[PDB]
Write a protein that binds this ligand. Structure first.
Ligand SMILES: [Mg+2]
Ligand SMILES: [Mg+2]
Ligand SMILES: [Mg+2]
Ligand SMILES: [Mg+2]
Ligand SMILES: [Mg+2]
Ligand SMILES: [Mg+2]
Ligand SMILES: [Mg+2]
Ligand SMILES: [Mg+2]
Ligand SMILES: [Mg+2]
Ligand SMILES: [Mg+2]
Ligand SMILES: [Mg+2]
Ligand SMILES: [Mg+2]
Length: 132
RNA sequence: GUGAAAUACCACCCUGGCGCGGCUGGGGGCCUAACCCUCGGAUGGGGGGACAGCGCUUGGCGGGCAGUUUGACUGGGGCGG
């Protein structure tokens, strides 16, 4: 852990829960990268991956453009693009792919479908945030 | 590049571990002051001691007791059927 991270996670809270349009203006500032950042928001998933009847995939494309699947640990990963679009074209876009993801929920998925969501980068720290 | 997986700063997760803390269940030891026993004497001393005893509750063992059941046919009834 370098010092770019020492002022990264000192400037943001994994302690305090946040919302999605509140924390989406902080997405380009908290990446100190030397180049080429791509922003990744993540969610833990409320399904049992050992049951393949609960599995999901497809190709659905973001409104903006470049520039979703469940693994055997039952969590979520997906690229939305390249750094590109600024805070207000992201907070605008930050509700776009999530609600497009909720439409894949298998029936036998027991419990809260999106367990916890931290907005982060490939370059950046943990921020408690709400998909809402 | 002879394994399909890429060996970066990252979160999101699995799996176990310890670390702190929040809620916590469980054990041991010591104490005394409730409670108990005792003390020619006591607003006290000694002994036991949060046990025991007692309340409410759980499940159990339980002829020591209680209420009862223990069929009809039948060349008498039972036995047999
Ligand atoms: Mg003692
Ligand atoms: Mg005394
Ligand atoms: Mg005493
Ligand atoms: Mg007691
Ligand atoms: Mg009996
Ligand atoms: Mg009797
Ligand atoms: Mg009677
Ligand atoms: Mg008879
Ligand atoms: Mg006859
Ligand atoms: Mg006769
Ligand atoms: Mg007879
Ligand atoms: Mg008979």
């Amino acid at each position: 852990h370098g010092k770019r991270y020492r002022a990264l996670l000192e400037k943001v809270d994994p302690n305090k829960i946040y919302t999605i349009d509140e924390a989406a203006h902080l997405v380009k500032e908290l990446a100190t990268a030397k180049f080429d950042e791509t922003v990744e928001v993540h969610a833990k998933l409320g399904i049992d991956p050992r049951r393949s009847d609960q599995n999901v995939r497809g190709t659905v494309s973001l409104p903006h453009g470049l520039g979703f699947r469940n693994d055997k640990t039952g969590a979520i990963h997906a690229p939305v693009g390249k750094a590109s679009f600024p805070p207000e074209k992201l907070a605008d876009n930050i509700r776009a792919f999530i609600r497009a993801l909720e439409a894949h929920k298998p029936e036998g998925a027991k419990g809260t479908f999106l367990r916890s969501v931290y907005v982060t980068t490939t370059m950046g720290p943990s921020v408690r945030i709400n998909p809402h």
